[PDB]
Amino acid sequence: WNSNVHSYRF
Amino acid sequence: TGSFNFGIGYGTESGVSFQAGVQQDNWLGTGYAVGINGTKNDYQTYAELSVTNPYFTVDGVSLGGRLFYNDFQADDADLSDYTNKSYGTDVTLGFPINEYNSLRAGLGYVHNSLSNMQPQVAMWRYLYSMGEHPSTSDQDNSFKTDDFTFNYGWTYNKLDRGYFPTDGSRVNLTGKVTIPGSDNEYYKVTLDTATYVPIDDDHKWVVLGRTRWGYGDGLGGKEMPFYENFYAGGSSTVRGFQSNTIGPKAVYFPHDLSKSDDAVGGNAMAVASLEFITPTPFISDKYANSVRTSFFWDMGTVWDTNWDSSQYSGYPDYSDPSNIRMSAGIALQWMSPLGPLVFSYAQPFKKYDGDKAEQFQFNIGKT
Numbered sequence: 001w002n003s004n005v006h007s008y009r010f
Numbered sequence: 011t012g013s014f015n016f017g018i019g020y021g022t023e024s025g026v027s028f029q030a031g032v033q034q035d036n037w038l039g040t041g042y043a044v045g046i047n048g049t050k051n052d053y054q055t056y057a058e059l060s061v062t063n064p065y066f067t068v069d070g071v072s073l074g075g076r077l078f079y080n081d082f083q084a085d086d087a088d089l090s091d092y093t094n095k096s097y098g099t100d101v102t103l104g105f106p107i108n109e110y111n112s113l114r115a116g117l118g119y120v121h122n123s124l125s126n127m128q129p130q131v132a133m134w135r136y137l138y139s140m141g142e143h144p145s146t147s148d149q150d151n152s153f154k155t156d157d158f159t160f161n162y163g164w165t166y167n168k169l170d171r172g173y174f175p176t177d178g179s180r181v182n183l184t185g186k187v188t189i190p191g192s193d194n195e196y197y198k199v200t201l202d203t204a205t206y207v208p209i210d211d212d213h214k215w216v217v218l219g220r221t222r223w224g225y226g227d228g229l230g231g232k233e234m235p236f237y238e239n240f241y242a243g244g245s246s247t248v249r250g251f252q253s254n255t256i257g258p259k260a261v262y263f264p265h266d267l268s269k270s271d272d273a274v275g276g277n278a279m280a281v282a283s284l285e286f287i288t289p290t291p292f293i294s295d296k297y298a299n300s301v302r303t304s305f306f307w308d309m310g311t312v313w314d315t316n317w318d319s320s321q322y323s324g325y326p327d328y329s330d331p332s333n334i335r336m337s338a339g340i341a342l343q344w345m346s347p348l349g350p351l352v353f354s355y356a357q358p359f360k361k362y363d364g365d366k367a368e369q370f371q372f373n374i375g376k377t
Contacts, residue, residue: 001173002029003015004349004375010011 011035019349019375022368023244023253025052025086029376033060042075051377053086072104074116082237088253088366090133090260090272093126094237102161114163117189122237124153130260131267131322132274132314136233140194146263155193155235161186169206173345174302176213176287180204188229196234198226206287214295216287218304222247224279233316239275242310242335245371247281249308250337250356252366257312258328259364269325271364274314278331281310285341300345308356309336326363336360349375 017029028050037044042061049056058078066073077099085091102116127133129146137144137153144151166181180203187197201223209215224240227233243251257276262268285306289295317328339356352373361367 001350002376003017005016005018007013007015009013 017349017376019373019377021245021373021377022371023246023373024054024377027051027375027377037061053083055081066103070106074102074104076100076102088255088273089241090130090270090274091126091128092124092133092237095123095125097121100161110166110168112165114161116161118157118159118161118186120157120159122155122157122235124237125151127151127153128260129263129265130274131263132258132260132317132328133236134263135316135318136236139228139231139233147265149265157192157194158189159186159192160189169204171299173350174299174343175204175206176208176216177206179206194235195230195232196226196228196238198224198234198238200224200240212295214289214298218283218285218287220281220283220285222279222281222310226277227315234277236274239277240279240312241273241275242279242281242312243273243365244368245352245354245373247308248283248310248335248337248358249306249339249341249354249371250358250367250369251335251361252368255364255366255368256310256335258314258317261322261325267322267325269364271366273364276312276314276328278315279310279312280331281308283308290342302343304341304343305339306341306356307336307338309334309360311335333362334360335362335365346374 012034015031019027031047033043033045035043042063045060047058058076060076062074064072079097082094098120100116100118102114105113107113128149162185164183169175169178169180182202185199188195203221205219207217209217241254242248243256244253255273258274259270260272260274283306285304287304290301290303293301311331311334313331314328319327337356337358339354341354344351354371358367
C-alpha cells in the first residue's frame with residue numbers, strides 16, 4: 001500500500 | 011502531465027516512515043516519464059531518479075532506468091552495527107507475458123561503502139574471503155566494493171481482490187548474480203508465496219498459506235556480502251519475534267569471544283505461515299471488504315551455510331537450519347481513513363537463545 005496522505009495526479 | 015505522492019506510517023519494525031515522489035509523464039518533450047522518489051525510516055534513507063517509457067516497444071515491453079543513493083544503519087534494524095552508504099544505477103526491461111504474469115531482466119551497478127563495523131566472526135570471515143585483513147580489535151574499519159549484476163524477476167498475481175483477497179495466489183521470485191569484473195562474486199534468490207483458499211461460498215472463512223525463502227552464496231572462494239543477508243522475525247515474516255531477530259547472532263572478538271543476542275542474518279532462510287481468516291466479532295459481514303480477523307501459526311529459520319562449527323565448537327552451530335522458530339497468534343486489519351492498520355498479538359512457543367520476543371506488533375500507513 002502507498003501514498004496514504006495524498007496520491008495527487010495533475 | 012505528472013503526479014505528486016506523499017505517504018506516512020508507523021510500524022514497530024521500522025519506526026516512523028515517509029514516502030514521497032513526483033513525476034512528469036513527458037519531461038521536456040522526451041517521451042519518457044522522469045521521476046524522483048524518496049524513503050526514510052528508523053534505519054534507511056533512500057532516494058532515486060527514475061526514467062521509464064511505459065510502451066518502449068508496441069508489444070508492451072517497457073525500459074526503466076534508475077539512479078539511486080541509499081544509507082543503511084544496521085543497529086536501527088535490530089542487527090549488529092554497521093553502516094552501508096550505497097549508490098548506483100539499474101536498467102530493466104519489463105515483459106508482460108500475460109495479464110497475471112510479468113517478467114523483468116536488467117543490469118546494474120552498485121558501489122557499497124561499509125563503516126562502523128564492530129569486529130564479529132561471520133562479518134570478518136567474509137572480509138577475509140574478499141582479501142581484506144582487518145584488525146580483530148579496532149571498532150574503526152571501512153570497506154568499499156563496486157559490483158555489476160544481472161537481475162531477474164517474475165511476478166504472478168491471480169488474486170480476486172488486491173486488498174483483502176479471499177481466493178487465488180501471488181508468487182514473486184527475484185534473482186541476481188554478479189557479472190565478471192565485479193569486486194564481489196555471488197548469486198542470490200528469493201521466493202515469496204501467498205495462497206488464499208475460501209472454505210465457504212460467501213468467502214467469509216478463508217485459509218491463507220504463505221512462504222518466504224532465501225538462498226545466496228559465493229562463486230569462487232568469495233562469500234555473499236553480509237549486507238545482502240536474509241532475515242526473519244517481525245510482523246511481516248514471523249509474528250511474535252522482534253524484527254530480524256531470528257537466526258545467527260554476532261560472535262564478537264574481545265576488544266574468549268563473546269556470544270550475543272544481536273542478530274546478523276544469514277545466507278539461507280525459510281518461513282512458512284498458515285493463517286485462518288474469519289468474520290470479525292462485533293462487526294457485520296458487510297465490512298469484510300475493509301476489516302479482517304485471523305488466527306495464525308508462523309515459523310521460520312535463518313542460517314549461515316559457511317559457519318564453521320569445527321573451530322567454534324563451544325558456540326552454537328549457526329550452519330544448522332533445524333532450529334525452527336514458531337509462534338501462534340491473532341491479527342486484526344482495518345483499511346482505515348489513515349490507510350492500512352494491522353495489529354497482531356503472537357506468543358512465540360518455540361524460540362532459541364538470543365531470540366527476542368515482541369508479542370504486540372502494530373503498523374499504520376505505509377511501511
